[PDB]
Every structure is written in structure tokens, then in C-alpha cells.
Structure 1
Amino acid sequence: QISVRGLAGVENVTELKKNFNRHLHFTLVKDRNVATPRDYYFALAHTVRDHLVGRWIRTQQHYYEKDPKRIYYLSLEFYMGRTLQNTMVNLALENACDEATYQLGLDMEELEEIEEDAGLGNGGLGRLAACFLDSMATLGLAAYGYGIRYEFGIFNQKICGGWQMEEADDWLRYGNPWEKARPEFTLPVHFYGRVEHTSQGAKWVDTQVVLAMPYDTPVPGYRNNVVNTMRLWSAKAPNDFNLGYIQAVLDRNLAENISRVLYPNDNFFEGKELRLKQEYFVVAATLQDIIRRFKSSTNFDAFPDKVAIQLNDTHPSLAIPELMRVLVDLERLDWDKAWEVTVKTCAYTNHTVLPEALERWPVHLLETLLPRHLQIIYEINQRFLNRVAAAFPGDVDRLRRMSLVEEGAVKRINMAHLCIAGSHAVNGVARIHSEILKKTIFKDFYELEPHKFQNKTNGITPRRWLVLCNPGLAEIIAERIGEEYISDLDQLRKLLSYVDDEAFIRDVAKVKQENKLKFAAYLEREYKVHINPNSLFDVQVKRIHEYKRQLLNCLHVITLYNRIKKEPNKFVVPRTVMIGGKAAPGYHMAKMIIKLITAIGDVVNHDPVVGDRLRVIFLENYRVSLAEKVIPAADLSEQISTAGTEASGTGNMKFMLNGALTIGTMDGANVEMAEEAGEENFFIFGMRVEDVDRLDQRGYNAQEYYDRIPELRQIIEQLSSGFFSPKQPDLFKDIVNMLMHHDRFKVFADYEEYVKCQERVSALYKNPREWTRMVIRNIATSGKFSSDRTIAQYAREIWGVEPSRQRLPA
């Protein structure tokens, strides 16, 4: 059908069709009289998978022969989403499979919808890992993603009576055609036990053993024949585990619970033992695998030359003391040499400055679970603090501040401090974030070792986030500038020369309209909700969090509603306000915010005076597959976190690439986005980081805003009195109380500027031509935010490896 989707040659189409029928028969054990759409999906998935394996085997053979430096990306989350279309895109099979299935009398897009998301992540951090894997493969790096194969990923969100309900994401029930179990490479992982000191050093003994079984998933590069591996560990009990008899077998679940479920927290630390076990489990199994591969090339001086370990947040921070443990206790290296190797091998990416998100493990947990690691952390700390003391003599406050061990009622290990000490590089994820790190929470460390601190602004893969989810836009762009931009997104700058091109303006606007119609149809079909596709699609999709300020969006929505109710017969630009995202199950305020959104919808969507001029939709079960649908459909991207709180954001970048304008604070990567596009082409509002600091200094008083803004008063009075909850007038008391008395994120302080800025948005939307021209200016300058750029920077500035667009033999 379209060019970017590749060739549909007669030879390939015929070959795909026969292998499809082969898999349906031999693999699925079905005939075409009993086969369901799901069977057809699996037959296609198996057919496409076959095309990966040849390239997968030869890529891994290529690495064995060339022995390049290997990159190990350690993450507790990989938010992969669906794999079928991505695989087709990267192998140039999309049109051929489209043709092959059509000739079999099947709609491929229908089959694509059957695939479950691999939802092994919470949001941005897990999705960043997924984009990174894609870019590393596309840039020909010898890279391995290492994580946990959760049996249950991020919960499926059901909305019931306006409330979030969670259900288990049983993503593996029908099987996962993409993974290959590798039980032959199963590794033991040790827990508990005790430390014994001998003549020949420390020994970790009397441990409980849990087996780590790897499952390998192929990660194809974009049309370069590179297929890298994501290896995910599954917890298995040893066969002599607890070996009355029946109970001992049933108690195997205790061990295997380690890989059972993803902790559903976004940007929030829950100090639970099971989570710590997960963190060590991935680290211990991964490091053995790394060392095994390294030895299969005794001399650990070359370890840092052949290995890079990237810590995605502090979650895999135990890699540092674990590497030390292995080098010192098992390989018998002296401390100093082991430490040198460790530091040069490890690098740490920080993703947050929110205090509640920072990992601080109680010493008593580490003492019981990982007694040798605690000893190593203590020794790391002492030697590190000796360096601090030597650099800043007499500065006893600094010593306390920089210690890996935090004092208090419960002693804790600050994992971020551990990571900085044991890494040669520490990076933030957007320029403003990296600067905040050096100025605030890691200031002491930056003063001690300024060379360690870097920025690596986040990115998104233009394969998934343009070509896959927005083929129409990919195509109209390719018509003008060719296909090279897909793996060289900076080429989108060439589109600046088309900003006054009447054909291009029409096409850009046509593609958006088509996307909106398709999404309006999706909503009716799958959720039975009526929306006006001519309205401005105003969308905020991301995890529900106070810092992300879905509440500020809510206030604006109510403002628009109240203004309509006051002047019913005045013209307002029609809007469909879509808000979606999951709340962590234990996050009460976030669950209340979801209820508020639906409560507002229940009032607004049924007011006859409003008509179709304002609709409020809560998008249920927001996830990667839903993002791929709603983002291409968006006109306005809400990126309205309090300045200084959203480390980068990546949703922002997705919207920019897909032809939405951005309303946002100068937070995270929004700053760089506005810088790239030009501030004129962004809807920037609200406090900057410095304004937030000034407000904190004099004290934030929400009442002041309430007293001085009548429109804001009205909303709060509406919330308090039960306007949006008549049967439970006090339902939103917690929300109002928080807003009025303990709002850490200063919702009210940005309200006026936000509403005003939103008026500027509506004004521009009234002029379709100028809206689209600004859209073109955004798409055209979104090149910097390709994860190919990000990964190339990691490669050159941290990992010490050169990216390559050179193709491997097919």
C-alpha cells in the first residue's frame, strides 16, 4: 500500500503464505475450519519470528568472532509493548505480510490487535529501556538488555463506577512466541546465609538457592540485519528445595514468587523485601552471565575494556557490591584492583529527584538477605568517606551528607550514593535535570568528582513512535525527503523548507484528521463513547501522579465548563479532553484523581447546554499499545508537571513527533523541545524552577490564589459542596484539603498562567493553516529526541564504543 512499509514481491508473498499455513498446521495444530483470529495471529507471529532467527544466530556469532566491547543494560523494567508490527517494520516485511495475509483473506491490522502488550514496565523508565534496546540494535552495538521475566506485568486497569480496579496482567496465558527459554543457561542465585571469615578471605555460606532461568527475546535493528538479545530471568526452585512431601513441593512457589509480579509503582519507592530480592536476583544472575561470557573470549584488567554495565536507575545498584563480591571473594582480586574494575565497568543513570522515589534500603533487610553485600557496602563507604575527608578536611557535615549509610531511627543505605561512588559516569536524563542533580541532591558528589557527571537527554525510537504508529505521517514525510530519516531523525529538519508548501500543509492536516477519525472510531467500537472528531484533541496520557498535575488539567476543564455555563451561546473552540493513565494501587490520592476525572466527565458529558463543545474522557488502561493509537490522534500534548519534578518525560517527545502542539512547563525535556522548535512554536507557561524555589523560600500559600482568583474559588467551592458528587457531597474532601493546605506541587500557582495559555491554544486552533504550520515546525525539529541520538551519546561518552549503521550480511 505505502512506500515506507517495504516491498511486497511475489517471491516473498508466496513464501510467507506457505510458512503461515505451515505454522497454522504444524505449530498451532489447527485447520482453517477451526482456526480463530488468535490462531491466525500466532501463525503470522511464528512466520515473522522465523525471519528473525537466522539473523539472530549470525548476529550473536558475529559478536563471538569480532569480540567487541559488550553493553549490558540492566533494568528491572522493559516496557516492550507489542512485538509483531515492530518486527515487520525492522525487517521490511510489513507490506509483504500485509499482502500475504490479504491473499489468505485476513486483515493483518485485526491480527495485530490480538497480541498482548509485553507490559514489563510502569511507564517512562521501562519504555525508555525498550526504546534504548531498539536504538542499540539499530546502531549495531553489541548490547544486551537484562531484566526479569515477570509472570504478571503492569496490571490491566478497569474503570468501575469511576474508580480504578486492578486485574492481573496474565500476558503469558496464550504463550509468548517471541521468547526462547534457555533452561540450559540456568544460574544459581543466593539469598540469606551468613558470612564466614577464613585464612583465604570471606565466604558466604548457608545460603538459600534460587535458580535463575533465562528467556531470550530478539531485538531487531532497523533494516541492518542486527538482532540483539533481551535476556529476562525467571525464578525457579531447586529440585531438592525444602526436600511433609506435598507441602515441600507446594512451597516451591516461595522461591518462584521472585519473578511473579512487577511492582506497579511509578516514581515511588516501596521498601519491600520481595522487591529487594527481585533487584538482587536480576543483578546476581546477570553478572554471572557477564563474567561467563567474558571468560569465554582470568585477567580482569581488560574487563572494563570488554564490558560496560549501565544501571537503569538505582534498581540494579547491587551490581556494584555484587561485582566486588565476585572479584574479591571468588576471583581473589585485591580490593583496590576490584574497585578500579568495578568503577570503570559501571555507569549510573538517575531518573528522578523526587525524595519518595529514591531507594533507601533499611540496613536490617540487607543484613538478613545479603549479609556479604552489606559488609562490602560498609567497606565501600569507609574508603569513599576517607577520600571525602582528604578532599574536604574538617567538613564533618559533608561526611554525613555523602555517606552511603544514612543515620536515624532505622539505618538505611542510600542506593544513589552507592551508585555514584561505584560508577565512572552518572547522568541525568534531560539538561535541566542533570543541572539540578549537580546543583542540589548530588552537589557534594559533583564537587568531589565533577568529571563523573554528564547529561544524556532521553529519546524515543522513531520506528515505534512514528513509522509503526503513524504510517500516514511517515509516508507524507518520506514522499518529500526520502526514507533515510527513519534511522537519522535529524533529517526531519529538511521539512522546514515545506512550512509554506500548501500541498504539505494539507497533507499534514489530512493525516491528523485521518488519525483522529480512526481513534474516534476505536473509542466507539471498543468503549462505546461518542466524540466529535472536529474538536481539538486535548490529551494528557501518563501515569497518574501529583507531580504530573492531572489536577491542574482538571481545574482547566472545570473552568471551561463553568465559562460555557456562564455564556452558553458564546462560541468556544470544541475540545475533547482525554486523560488516561494508571495509578499505583496503593496511591490513594492518584486513585482519587481518577475518580475526579470521571466525575467531571459524568457532569460535563451529560450537560445538554455544553453539547459537543466539551467532552471529558478518561482513557482506560493506558499502555504502550494505546499510546500508539492516541498519540498520532492528538492535537495538544499536556506536559504540565511542576518545574523541576519531571526529570525528562518521553511522552512529550512522542507527541511532538506525531504532530501535536505542546502546552507545557519548562520542565524536563520540554525545555530542550522548546529550544529546538523555537519558543514561539511552543505553548510555554508557568513557574520556572527558579520561581518554584522562590515560592518555597517565602512559603507556598494556596489560600492566596483562592482568595484572589474568583474562577478558582468557584471550582473549589464546587468540589467541596458536592457539585461533581451529589450522592457523596464530601467525596473530594481529600483533594480539596490537599490543594488548599499541603500541595507539594503548587497546582494553584500555575493555574492563571495555564488557563491563559490554553486560551492562546484555542485561538491558534481557530486558524487551521497556522496551527498546521506550527505543527510542521515541531515535527521538523524533533530530530534531537530520537533515542538513536541518545544512545550514540551513551556509546561515545560513557561506554567507549562507536555506533555503526553498517548492515550485517542477511
Structure 2
Amino acid sequence: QISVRGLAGVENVTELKKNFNRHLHFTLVKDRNVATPRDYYFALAHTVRDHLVGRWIRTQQHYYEKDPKRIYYLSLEFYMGRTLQNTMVNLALENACDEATYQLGLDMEELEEIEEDAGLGNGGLGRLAACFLDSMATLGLAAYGYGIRYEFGIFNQKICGGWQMEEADDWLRYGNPWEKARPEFTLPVHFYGRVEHTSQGAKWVDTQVVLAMPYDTPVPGYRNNVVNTMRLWSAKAPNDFNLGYIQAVLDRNLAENISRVLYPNDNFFEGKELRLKQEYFVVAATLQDIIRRFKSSTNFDAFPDKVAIQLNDTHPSLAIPELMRVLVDLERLDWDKAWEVTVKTCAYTNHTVLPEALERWPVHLLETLLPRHLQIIYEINQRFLNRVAAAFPGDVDRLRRMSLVEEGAVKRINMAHLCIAGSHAVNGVARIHSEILKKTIFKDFYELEPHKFQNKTNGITPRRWLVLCNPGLAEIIAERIGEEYISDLDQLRKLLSYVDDEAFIRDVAKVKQENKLKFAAYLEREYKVHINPNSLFDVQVKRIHEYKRQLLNCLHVITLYNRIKKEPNKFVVPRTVMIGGKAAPGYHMAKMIIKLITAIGDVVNHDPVVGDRLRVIFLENYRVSLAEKVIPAADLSEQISTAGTEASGTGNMKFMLNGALTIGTMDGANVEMAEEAGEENFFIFGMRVEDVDRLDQRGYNAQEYYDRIPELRQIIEQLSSGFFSPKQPDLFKDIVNMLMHHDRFKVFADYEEYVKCQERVSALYKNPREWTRMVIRNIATSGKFSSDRTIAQYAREIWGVEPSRQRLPA
């Protein structure tokens, strides 16, 4: 059908058809009379993955032969989504499989909807890891993703009576064709026990053993025949475990609970023992695998030349004392040499500045669970603090501020301080975020070691986030500038010379309209909801948090509603306002916000006077597969975090690439996006970081805004009186209370300027040609935000390796 999806040759289609039927028969044990769509999906999945094996075996063979420096990306989250379409794309098989399935009498898109998301992450941090793996393979890097194979990923969100309900994400129910169990590489991990001191150093004894069983998943590069590995560990009890008899067998569950479920808290910290076990489990198993592979290349001086370990936030921070443990206790290196090796091997990426999101483990937990690691941490702290003392003599408060050990009610280890001490590089994820680290939360560490601190602005993969999810847009671009931009996104700049091209303008606008039509149909079919596809699609999708200010969006929505009821026969640009995202199960306020959104929809969507001019939809169960649908259909991207709170954002980049305009604050990567497109092509509003600081010194008084803005006053009184909750009049008292008295994120302070800026959006949308030309200027400048650029920067400035766009032989 379309060019970018590859060739549909005669021998290929024929071969795919026969292998499809082979798998349906031999692998699935079905015939065409009993098979359901699910069987058909599986036959296809097996037919496609067969094409990976040769490339996978020789890629791994190649790294053994050439022995390059290895990159290990350690994360507790890999938010992969679906794998079938992504594999076809990177292997140039999409059109061939479309044809083969068509000829078999099947619709391939229908089959793709059957695959479950691999939802092994929460949000931005997890999806970043997924985009990164794709870019690392596309760039020919010898990279491995290491993590945990959670039996249950992020929960499926059901909305019941306007309230979020959680249900288990049993994603392995039907089996996962995209994994290969490797029980032969099972490794032991130790917990509890005690430390014995002898003539020849410390020994960790009387431990409980849990087994780590690896599952390998292939990561194909873009049309370069490179297939990298993501290795996920699963927890297994050893066979003498607890070994009245029945109970001993049943208690095996305890050990295997380590890998059972993903913790659904993002940007918040909970000191639970099970979570600490997960963190150590992944670190301990991964490091033995690393060392094993290194020895199969005595001399650990060369270790940092052959190994890089990237820590995705502080979650795998135990890698630092664990590497020390192995080097000191098991390999018998002296402390100083072990430490030199550790520091040069490790690097740390920070993903937030929110205080409550920082990991500070109680000392008594580490004491019981990991007694040797606590000892090593104390020793690291001592030697680090002596360095501080020597650089800043007499500065006693600096010493307590920089200590890895935090004194107080309970003693805690600050895992972020550990990471900075034990890494040769520390980076933030957007320029403003990286500067904030140097100036505020890690100021003391920056003064001690300025050379460690870097920026690596986030990116998204243009394969999943353009080619895969928006084929129409990828095709009209390809027609004009060719296909090379897919793995070199800077080439999109060449589209600037098409901003006055009338055919292109018409094509860009047509692609959007078709995406909107397709999505409006999806909503009617799978969710029985009616929307006007002519309206402006105003979308905010991301995890529910107070700092992301879904509430500010709510206030705007209520303003438009109130203005309509005021002047019903006045003209307004119609909108479909879509908000989606999951709330963390214990986050009460976030759950109330979801309830508010649905409650506004109940009033707005059934007011006859409004008509189809305003619609408020809550998008249930937001996740990667839903993002791939809603993002290409959006006109307006809401990126309205309070300045200084969103480290980067990546959602923002997805919308930019897919032809939506952005309303947002000067926060995280928004700053760099506006800088790339030109501020005139962006809807910037609200306080900058400096304005926020000024307001804090002075003291934020919400009352002041309530007193001076009558439209804001009206909204508050409607919330309070029960306008949006007639049966439960005081349902939203908590939200009003928080807004009026306890608002950390200054919702009222940006209200006026936000509503105003939203009027300017409406104004531009009235002029289709001028809307579309600004869109073209956004897409054309989105090249910087490809994760290929990000990864090339990591490679050169942190890991010390050269990316390569060269093909491996097929």
C-alpha cells in the first residue's frame, strides 16, 4: 500500500504464507476451521520471530569475535508495549506480511490488536528505557537491557462510577512468544545472613538463596540486521527450599514473590522490603552475568575499558556496593583499586527533583537484608567525607549535607548521594533539569566535582513514534525528502522549504483529519462514546500527578463551559477535551482528580445548550498501545507542569513529531522544543522557574487570586456547593481545600495566563491554513528529540564508544 512499509515481493509473500500455515498446524495444533483470531495472531508472531533468529545468533557471535566495550543498561522498568509491528518495521516485513495475511483472508491490523502490551513500567522512565534500547540497536552498540520479568506489570485501569479501579495485568496468561527462557544460565542471589571477619577479609555467611532465571527478548535495530538482547530475571526457589512437607512446597511462593509484581508508584518513595529485594535481585544477578562475560573475553584494570553500567535512576544503585563487594571480598582486590574500577564503570541518570520521590532506605532494613552492603556503604561514606573535609576544611554543615547517611528519627541511606559518589558521570534529562541539579539539590557535589555533571536531553524513537503509529504522515514526508530521515531525524529540517507548498499543506492537514476520523471511530466502537471529529482535539495524557496540573486543565474546561452558559448564542471553536492517565493506587488526591474529570464530563456532555461544542472525555487505561493511537490524532498537546517540576517529559516530543501544537510552561524539554521551533510557533504561558522562586520567598497566597479573578471564584463556588456532585454535595472539599490552602504547585498563579493563551489557540485554529503551517514548522524542527541523538551523546560523552550505522551481513 504505502512505500515506507517495504517491498511485497513474490517469493517473500509465498514463503510467509507457507510458514504461517506451518505454525498454525505444528505449533498451535489447529486447522483453519477451529482457529480464532488469537491463534492467527500467534501464527503470525511465530512467522515473524523466525526472521530474527539468524540475525540474533550472528549479532551475539559478532560481539564475541570483535569483543567491543559492552553497555549494560540497568533499569527496574522497561515499558515496551507491543512487539509484532515494531519487529516487522525494523525488518522491512510490514507490507509483505500485510499482503500474505490479506491473501490468507485475514486483516493484519485486527491481529495486531490482539497482542498484549508488555507493561513493565509506570510512565516516562520506563518508556525511555524502551526507546533507548531501540536506538542502541539502530546505532550498532553492543548493549544489553537488564531488568525484572514481572509476572504482573502496570495494572489495567477500569473506571467505575467515575472512580479508578485496578485489576491485575496478567500479561503472560496466553504465553509470550517474544521471550526465550534460558534456565541454563540460572544464577544464585543471596539475602539476609551475617558478616564474619577472618584473617583474609570479611565473609558473608548463613544467607538465604533465591535463584535468578534469565529470559531473553530480542531488540532489533532499524534495517541494519543488528539484534541486541534484553535480559529479564525471574525469581525461582531452590529445590531444597524449606525442605510439614506440603507447606514447605507451598512456601516456595515467598521466594518467587520477588518478581511477581511491578510497584505502581512513580515520582513517590515507599520503603517496602519487597521493593528492596527487587532492587538487589536485579543488581546481583546482572553483575555476575557481567563479570562472567568479562572473564570469557584476572586483570580488572581493563574492566572499565570493556564494561559500562548505566543506572536508570537510583533503583539499581546497589550495583555500586555490590561491585565493590565482589571485587574486594571475592576477587581480593584492594579497596582503592576496586573503587577506581567501580567509579570508572558506573554512571547515574537522575529523573526527578521531587523530594518525596528520592530513595532513602532505613538503615535497619539494610542491616537485616544486606549486612555486608551496609558495611561497604559506611566505608564509602567515611572515605568520601574525608575528601570533602580536605577540600572544604572547617565546613561542618557541608559534611552533614553531603553524607550518604542521613541522621534523624530513623537513620537512612540517601541512594542519590551514593550514586554521585560512585559514578564518573551524573546527568539530568533536559538542559533546565541538569542546571537545576547543579544549582540546587546537588550543588554541594557539583562544587566538589564539577566534571561529573552533564546533560543528556531525552528523546523518543522515530520508528515507534512516527513510522509505526503514523504511517500516513511518514509517507507524505517520504514522498518529498526520501526515507533516510527515519534513522537520521535531523533531515526533517528539509521540510521547512515546504511550508508555503500548497500541496504539502493540504497533505499534512489531510493526514491529521484521517487520524482524527480513525480515532473518533475507535472511541465509538470499543467504548461507545460519540465525538465530533471536526472539533479541536485537546489532549492531556500522562500519569496523574499534582505537579502535572491536570487540575489547571480542569479549571479551563469549567471556564469554557461557564462562558458558553453565559453567552449560549455566541460562537466558539468546538473542542474535544481528552484527559487520560493512571493514578498510583495509594495516591488519594490523584484519584479525586480522576473523579473530578469524569464529574465535569457528566455535566458538560449532557447539557443541551452546549451541543457538540464542548466534550470532556476521560481516556481509560492509558498505556503505550493507546498512546500510539491518540497521539497521531491530537491537535493540541497539554504540557502544563509547574515550572521546575517536570525533569524532561517525553510525551511532549511524541506530540511534536505527530503534528500537534503545544500549550505549555517553560519546563523540562518544552524549553528546548520551543527553542528549536521558535517561540512564535509554540503556545508558551505562565511562570518561569525564577517567578516560582520569587513567589515562594514572598509566600504563595491562593486567596489573593480567588479575590481578584471573578471567573476563578465562580468555579470554586461551583465545586464547593456541589454543582458537579449533586447527590454528594461536599465530594470535592479536599480538592478545594488543597487549592485554597495547601497547593505546592501554584495552580491559581498560572490560571489567568493559561485561559488567555488558550483563547489564542482557538483563534489560530479558526485559520486552518495558518494552523497547518505552524504545525509544519514544529514537525520540521523535531529532529533533535530523536533518541538516536540522545544515545549517540551517551555513547561519546559517557560510555566512550562510537555509534555505527553500518549493516551486519544479512
TM-score of the aligned structures, taking structure 1 as reference length: 1.00
Partner of 2:380: 380
Which digits, 9 at most, give the CA deviation of each residue in 1:746-792, with x for residues without a partner?
Answer: 00000001000000000000000000000000000000000000000
Which digits, 9 at most, give the CA deviation of each residue in 1:211-238, with x for residues without a partner?
Answer: 0000000000000000000000000000
User: 1:639, CA displacement in angstroms?
Assistant: 0.2
User: 1:359, CA displacement in angstroms?
Assistant: 0.5
Moved over 6 A (4+): none
Query: Following the alignment from structure 1 to structure 2, what is the Cα–Cα distance between the partners of residues 370 and 135?
Result: 36
Query: Following the alignment from structure 2 to structure 1, what is the Cα–Cα distance between the partners of residues 722 and 324?
Result: 59
Q: How does 1:30-179 map to 2 (within 5 A)?
A: 30-179=30-179
Partner of 1:789: 789
Query: Following the alignment from structure 2 to structure 1, what is the Cα–Cα distance between the partners of residues 70 and 155?
Result: 33
Which digits, 9 at most, give the CA deviation of each residue in 1:78-132, with x for residues without a partner?
Answer: 0000000000000000000000000000000000000000000000000000000
Which digits, 9 at most, give the CA deviation of each residue in 1:496-549, with x for residues without a partner?
Answer: 000000000000000000000000000000000000000000000000000000
Query: Following the alignment from structure 1 to structure 2, what is the Cα–Cα distance between the partners of residues 752 and 270?
Result: 36
Query: Following the alignment from structure 1 to structure 2, what is the Cα–Cα distance between the partners of residues 335 and 29?
Result: 59
User: 1:143, CA displacement in angstroms?
Assistant: 0.2
Which digits, 9 at most, give the CA deviation of each residue in 1:161-181, with x for residues without a partner?
Answer: 000000000000000000000
Query: Following the alignment from structure 1 to structure 2, what is the Cα–Cα distance between the partners of residues 33 and 268?
Result: 51
User: 1:551, CA displacement in angstroms?
Assistant: 0.3
Which digits, 9 at most, give the CA deviation of each residue in 1:669-716, with x for residues without a partner?
Answer: 000000000000000000000100100100000011011100000111
Which digits, 9 at most, give the CA deviation of each residue in 1:330-377, with x for residues without a partner?
Answer: 000000000000000000000000001111100111111101000001
Query: Following the alignment from structure 1 to structure 2, what is the Cα–Cα distance between the partners of residues 374 and 695?
Result: 41
Partner of 1:630: 630
Which digits, 9 at most, give the CA deviation of each residue in 1:383-440, with x for residues without a partner?
Answer: 0000000000000000000000011000100000000000000000000000000000
Query: Following the alignment from structure 2 to structure 1, what is the Cα–Cα distance between the partners of residues 477 and 466?
Result: 11
Which digits, 9 at most, give the CA deviation of each residue in 1:574-630, with x for residues without a partner?
Answer: 000000000000000000000000000000000000000000000000000000000
Query: Following the alignment from structure 1 to structure 2, what is the Cα–Cα distance between the partners of residues 268 and 171?
Result: 25
Query: Following the alignment from structure 2 to structure 1, what is the Cα–Cα distance between the partners of residues 378 and 689?
Result: 36
Q: Gaps (5+ residues) in structure 1?
A: none
**How many residue pairs were aligned?**
810
**Equivalent position SS for 1:537:** strand
Query: Following the alignment from structure 2 to structure 1, what is the Cα–Cα distance between the partners of residues 569 and 53?
Result: 63
Query: Following the alignment from structure 2 to structure 1, what is the Cα–Cα distance between the partners of residues 321 and 346?
Result: 11
**Equivalent position SS for 2:97:** helix
User: 1:57, CA displacement in angstroms?
Assistant: 0.5
**Equivalent position SS for 1:232:** strand
Query: Following the alignment from structure 1 to structure 2, what is the Cα–Cα distance between the partners of residues 696 and 105?
Result: 64
**Equivalent position SS for 2:408:** coil
Partner of 2:728: 728
Query: Following the alignment from structure 1 to structure 2, what is the Cα–Cα distance between the partners of residues 129 and 268?
Result: 19
Query: Following the alignment from structure 1 to structure 2, what is the Cα–Cα distance between the partners of residues 192 and 743?
Result: 42
Query: Following the alignment from structure 1 to structure 2, what is the Cα–Cα distance between the partners of residues 738 and 4?
Result: 51
User: 1:662, CA displacement in angstroms?
Assistant: 0.3
User: 1:647, CA displacement in angstroms?
Assistant: 0.1
Query: Following the alignment from structure 2 to structure 1, what is the Cα–Cα distance between the partners of residues 488 and 442?
Result: 34
Query: Following the alignment from structure 1 to structure 2, what is the Cα–Cα distance between the partners of residues 565 and 374?
Result: 64
**Equivalent position SS for 1:308:** strand
User: 1:266, CA displacement in angstroms?
Assistant: 1.4
User: 1:378, CA displacement in angstroms?
Assistant: 0.5
Which digits, 9 at most, give the CA deviation of each residue in 1:15-48, with x for residues without a partner?
Answer: 1111110111111111110000000000000000
**Equivalent position SS for 1:190:** strand
**Equivalent position SS for 1:57:** helix
Query: Following the alignment from structure 2 to structure 1, what is the Cα–Cα distance between the partners of residues 465 and 250?
Result: 44
Query: Following the alignment from structure 1 to structure 2, what is the Cα–Cα distance between the partners of residues 98 and 298?
Result: 53
Q: Gaps (5+ residues) in structure 2?
A: none
Query: Following the alignment from structure 2 to structure 1, what is the Cα–Cα distance between the partners of residues 732 and 484?
Result: 52
Query: Following the alignment from structure 1 to structure 2, what is the Cα–Cα distance between the partners of residues 274 and 565?
Result: 53
Query: Following the alignment from structure 2 to structure 1, what is the Cα–Cα distance between the partners of residues 605 and 634?
Result: 20
User: 1:244, CA displacement in angstroms?
Assistant: 0.6
Query: Following the alignment from structure 1 to structure 2, what is the Cα–Cα distance between the partners of residues 631 and 491?
Result: 22
Query: Following the alignment from structure 2 to structure 1, what is the Cα–Cα distance between the partners of residues 367 and 137?
Result: 39
Q: How does 1:420-439 map to 2 (within 5 A)?
A: 420-439=420-439
Query: Following the alignment from structure 1 to structure 2, what is the Cα–Cα distance between the partners of residues 393 and 200?
Result: 36
Query: Following the alignment from structure 1 to structure 2, what is the Cα–Cα distance between the partners of residues 585 and 278?
Result: 19
User: 1:197, CA displacement in angstroms?
Assistant: 0.5
**Equivalent position SS for 2:631:** helix
User: 1:270, CA displacement in angstroms?
Assistant: 1.2
Query: Following the alignment from structure 2 to structure 1, what is the Cα–Cα distance between the partners of residues 445 and 752?
Result: 38
**Equivalent position SS for 1:196:** strand
Query: Following the alignment from structure 1 to structure 2, what is the Cα–Cα distance between the partners of residues 366 and 769?
Result: 62
Query: Following the alignment from structure 1 to structure 2, what is the Cα–Cα distance between the partners of residues 180 and 195?
Result: 37
User: 1:452, CA displacement in angstroms?
Assistant: 0.2
Q: How does 1:282-297 map to 2 (within 5 A)?
A: 282-297=282-297
Query: Following the alignment from structure 1 to structure 2, what is the Cα–Cα distance between the partners of residues 499 and 265?
Result: 43
Query: Following the alignment from structure 2 to structure 1, what is the Cα–Cα distance between the partners of residues 175 and 758?
Result: 46
Q: How does 1:652-663 map to 2 (within 5 A)?
A: 652-663=652-663
Query: Following the alignment from structure 1 to structure 2, what is the Cα–Cα distance between the partners of residues 644 and 143?
Result: 32
**Equivalent position SS for 1:176:** coil
**Equivalent position SS for 1:493:** helix
Partner of 1:670: 670
User: 1:147, CA displacement in angstroms?
Assistant: 0.2
Query: Following the alignment from structure 1 to structure 2, what is the Cα–Cα distance between the partners of residues 367 and 563?
Result: 61
**Equivalent position SS for 1:310:** strand
User: 1:268, CA displacement in angstroms?
Assistant: 1.1
Instruction: Report the RMSD for the aligned CA atoms in angstroms.
Output: 0.4
User: 1:281, CA displacement in angstroms?
Assistant: 0.4
User: 1:267, CA displacement in angstroms?
Assistant: 1.0
Query: Following the alignment from structure 1 to structure 2, what is the Cα–Cα distance between the partners of residues 265 and 469?
Result: 28
Which digits, 9 at most, give the CA deviation of each residue in 1:272-324, with x for residues without a partner?
Answer: 00000000000000000000000000110000000000000000000000000
Q: How does 1:444-523 map to 2 (within 5 A)?
A: 444-523=444-523
Partner of 2:610: 610
User: 1:269, CA displacement in angstroms?
Assistant: 1.0
Partner of 2:8: 8
**Equivalent position SS for 2:231:** strand
Query: Following the alignment from structure 1 to structure 2, what is the Cα–Cα distance between the partners of residues 46 and 224?
Result: 21
Q: How does 1:240-639 map to 2 (within 5 A)?
A: 240-639=240-639
Query: Following the alignment from structure 1 to structure 2, what is the Cα–Cα distance between the partners of residues 207 and 570?
Result: 74
Which digits, 9 at most, give the CA deviation of each residue in 1:650-674, with x for residues without a partner?
Answer: 0000000000000000000000000
**Equivalent position SS for 1:805:** coil
Query: Following the alignment from structure 1 to structure 2, what is the Cα–Cα distance between the partners of residues 407 and 315?
Result: 22
Query: Following the alignment from structure 2 to structure 1, what is the Cα–Cα distance between the partners of residues 124 and 374?
Result: 31
User: 1:12, CA displacement in angstroms?
Assistant: 0.5
Partner of 1:680: 680
Query: Following the alignment from structure 2 to structure 1, what is the Cα–Cα distance between the partners of residues 3 and 267?
Result: 40
Q: How does 1:762-801 map to 2 (within 5 A)?
A: 762-801=762-801
**Equivalent position SS for 2:583:** coil
User: 1:731, CA displacement in angstroms?
Assistant: 0.4
